[PDB]
């Protein structure tokens, strides 16, 4: 189908933004140990919101790209509107680049005045730092986009894959609406903040990721659509049965009742299961491939996504999800460790996985690229992925020492925040080194095209 | 074991836990007046929340252990900087003197905040320190 071509601008832009994300990561990582680096021009918080918003935005672009590509094929017809897909692309790209520039070009409080935050105050919450007009512009893009892809499903064949993807996509946009709700009571603000972050990343985004995985396995493996889609329903069932009460693992210390200590701990303890099932899923249906596939990189991307999502979300998630432990590790370099591995292993990797399947047959080159291009992609895969495990090991060691020095001893014996950070210095230099190897990976990956 | 079976486990699981979740959030939301001491949630604390947001303190600091990990936990800072009595007065100095300019050290910005703004900040943080947080953090260092 020809309207599958509108996915290309989405995947390209996403990869450009991904580069920006890594550079601002590297700036912050240096700021950790040379604390006045780039100060006062780009204070760490400005660098941080660039890093974290570039991550959310580029992943969103990959998702829309992924939907624009596979929805036509599933639905067995042309996309409701290519000209819509392109108008939305430039609106979203300009709105993204605009809000990022606001962050860098005006002190935050000035950007707040300037965008009239005081009428509808939604700014200065983590991951949600974009002006209210930027948020509004994202909702409008998401409505367009959902109509575009949702109409295509309507007049076309329904499949479980495409309907789980749409459910996830709709859920994402809906939950995003809670970013407009900024209570005056701090505990209430935190309580609802997690309906965005947690119900995205351990709920609705898992429908998106799983749908993308299932499609790639349908196309790569020649295994029956019926069995693939069964396991897809099992996986997302386990996602939401663990995940919804699971939100509670963020409700231990924000000021809500202590029953959340139990509820949060017990259901979160089970949230690894879907990522475990996604590894049994990808490995088994690639093992059972009725046919070989010219692009052997995608198969690697799909196996690796599921192992990394499982290591990052499942294993690191679990290591700190029990309240008696989280009590000590809350808000610590351990959190940063888990968060890096989980966002990379689940979400960055699934976007690169669908790029690996779709890029050749979108630039009209074929199923796969020449064999030089394919060895690079794999190098960029191992370099990024291995670097990230090291990023997470070095931060995990930092987090363990932080907990020991700062969190465990009593008053008088416990080391101050600032002093314990000097003690962590080596681990932060080493992470910054790993961060360099990762960029070299992203560049190597990018030189595959 | 069929597809249809799996899809209904998904359907029933999600509705039931969605409804369990909403019911818990109804309950939880009833307890918040006492837990957070909303009685004390003054116009001053609510204005402080706005200055906390407008200057993105959370982009460098944690509050109740959430936010960024560059700078210290501010949920309980009030207890490390002369308590109830003298904390407001500390904070005024603290905001004026930034950046400290110590070579190689993590640096905090100068926000050119008015005295009312900083006082509202101090109330917000004081009040935040008193939320019943199930005894978090472990000690006075946050």
């Amino acid at each position: 189908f020809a309207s599958q071509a509108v996915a290309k601008p989405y995947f390209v832009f996403a990869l450009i933004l991904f580069v920006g994300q890594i550079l601002f990561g590297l700036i912050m990582g240096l700021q950790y140990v040379v604390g006045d680096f780039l100060f006062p021009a780009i204070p760490f918080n400005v660098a941080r919101m660039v890093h974290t918003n570039l991550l959310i935005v580029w992943l969103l672009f990959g998702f829309m790209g992924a939907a624009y590509y596979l929805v036509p094929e599933e639905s067995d017809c042309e996309l409701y509107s290519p000209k819509l897909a392109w108008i939305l692309f430039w609106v979203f790209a300009a709105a993204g680049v605009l809000t990022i520039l606001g962050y860098l070009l005006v002190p935050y409080a000035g950007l707040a005045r300037l965008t009239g935050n005081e009428l509808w105050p939604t700014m200065g919450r983590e991951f949600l730092e974009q002006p209210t007009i930027s948020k509004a512009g994202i909702v409008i893009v998401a409505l367009g986009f959902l109509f575009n892809v949702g109409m295509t499903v309507l007049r076309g064949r329904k499949t479980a894959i495409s309907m789980v993807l749409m459910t996830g996509l709709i859920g994402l946009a809906l939950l995003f609406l809670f970013s407009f709700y900024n209570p005056e009571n701090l505990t209430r603000d935190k309580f609802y903040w997690w309906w965005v972050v947690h119900l995205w990343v351990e709920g609705v985004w898992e429908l998106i990721m799983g749908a993308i995985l299932a499609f790639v396995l349908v196309k790569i493996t020649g295994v029956d659509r019926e069995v693939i889609e069964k396991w897809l329903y099992v996986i997302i069932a386990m996602a939401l049965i663990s995940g919804i009460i699971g939100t509670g693992h963020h409700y231990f210390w924000i000021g809500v009742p202590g029953y959340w200590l139990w509820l949060g701990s017990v259901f979160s303890a089970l949230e690894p299961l879907p990522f475990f099932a996604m590894v049994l899923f990808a490995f088994n249906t690639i093992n059972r491939r009725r046919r070989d596939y010219p692009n052997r990189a995608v198969a690697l991307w799909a196996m690796g996504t599921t192992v990394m999502a499982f290591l990052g979300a499942g294993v690191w998630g679990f290591m700190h999800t029990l309240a008696p432990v989280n009590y000590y590790t809350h808000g610590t370099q351990l959190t940063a460790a888990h968060g890096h591995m989980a966002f990379y292993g689940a979400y960055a990797m699934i976007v690169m996985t669908i790029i690996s399947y779709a890029m050749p047959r979108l630039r009209g080159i074929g199923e796969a690229m020449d064999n030089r291009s394919q060895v690079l992609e794999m190098w960029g895969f191992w370099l990024m992925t291995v670097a990230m495990v090291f990023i997470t090991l070095f931060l995990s060691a930092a987090g363990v020492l932080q907990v020991w020095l700062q969190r465990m001893p009593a008053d008088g014996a416990a080391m101050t925040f600032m002093a314990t950070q000097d003690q962590l210095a080596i681990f932060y230099w080493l992470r910054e080194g790993a961060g360099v190897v990762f960029l070299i990976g992203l560049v190597a990956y990018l030189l595959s095209f | 074991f069929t597809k249809g079976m799996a899809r209904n486990i998904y359907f029933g699981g999600s509705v039931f836990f969605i409804l369990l979740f909403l019911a818990l959030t109804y309950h939880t939301e009833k307890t918040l007046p006492e837990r957070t001491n909303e009685a004390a949630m003054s116009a001053a604390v609510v204005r402080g929340k706005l200055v906390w947001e407008q200057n993105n303190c959370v982009g460098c600091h944690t509050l109740l252990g959430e936010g960024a990990y560059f700078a210290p936990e501010l949920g309980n800072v009030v207890g490390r900087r002369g308590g109830e009595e003298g904390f407001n007065t500390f904070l005024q100095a603290w905001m004026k003197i930034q950046p400290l300019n110590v070579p190689g050290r993590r640096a905090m910005p100068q926000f050119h905040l008015s005295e009312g703004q900083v006082d509202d900040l101090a109330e917000f943080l004081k009040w935040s320190s008193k939320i019943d947080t199930n005894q978090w953090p472990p000690n006075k260092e946050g």
Partner: antibody, heavy 124, light 108 residues
């Protein structure tokens, strides 16, 4: 309240040694450099050195490398200074004091609290 | 080592008046000069650091200025308790060094 309590007057003979203490309270002892400062009568303050109790590292003015040895015992929050091969010139008041800032890399800063001083009198 | 010379060594003045005292470094210490007040029966008290930053709790009648090599301390309207010994200390480099003091005395 941050406080530093220093030990009492010590008398010693020339060529002997003396060891004094500084008991810290009201803060994280392991998180701040403890400095030691000499004052002889109408003679101007002199920085002897400092110890970082968080990792036991020390730093000495070259003029006191021979003379002074600095230690800390963290269970007790007390820092110690031992002065050896005493001479009339070591007769003075000796102060400990706390870096006003926390952490290892702020070795050269100012001090926000001082001890009341320990007198060392060297005589035959 | 950077050497510090304070002047004048003695200054007489009266309650309600303003004085300013000097501190000179033998080489540049950028902006890193602190000041301490010394009084009998009391531990030394940090007044100012980094040239002009007032230490927490210190009244605004104290102020300081300078960079590189030349620094001052001013008290705006002397109070009875301000008559005391004043020392400066450089905090730009190892080894830390101090000036020998200006003694501010009560005129009668």
């Amino acid at each position: 309240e941050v406080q530093l309590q220093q030990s009492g007057t010590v008398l010693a003979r020339p060529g002997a040694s003396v060891k004094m203490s500084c008991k810290a309270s009201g803060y994280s002892f392991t998180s701040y450099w403890m400095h030691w400062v000499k004052q002889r009568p109408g003679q101007g303050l002199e920085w002897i050195g400092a110890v970082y109790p968080g990792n036991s590292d020390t730093s000495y003015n070259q003029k006191f490398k021979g003379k002074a040895k600095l230690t800390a015992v963290t269970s007790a929050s007390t820092a110690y200074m031992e002065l050896s091969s005493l001479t009339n010139e070591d007769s003075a008041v000796y102060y400990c004091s706390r870096s006003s800032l926390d952490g290892y890399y702020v070795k050269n800063w100012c001090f926000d609290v001082w001890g009341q001083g320990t007198t060392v009198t060297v005589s035959s | 080592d950077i050497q510090m010379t304070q002047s004048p060594p003695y200054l007489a003045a009266s309650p309600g008046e303003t004085i300013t005292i000097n501190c000179r470094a033998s080489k540049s210490i950028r902006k890193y000069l602190a000041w301490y007040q010394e009084k009998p029966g009391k531990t030394n008290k940090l007044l100012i650091y980094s040239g002009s930053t007032l230490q927490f709790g210190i009244p605004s009648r104290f102020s300081g200025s300078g960079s590189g090599t030349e620094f001052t301390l001013t008290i705006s309207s002397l109070e009875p308790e301000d008559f005391a010994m004043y020392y400066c200390q450089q905090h730009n480099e190892y080894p830390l060094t101090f000036g020998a003091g200006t003694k501010l005395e009560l005129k009668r």
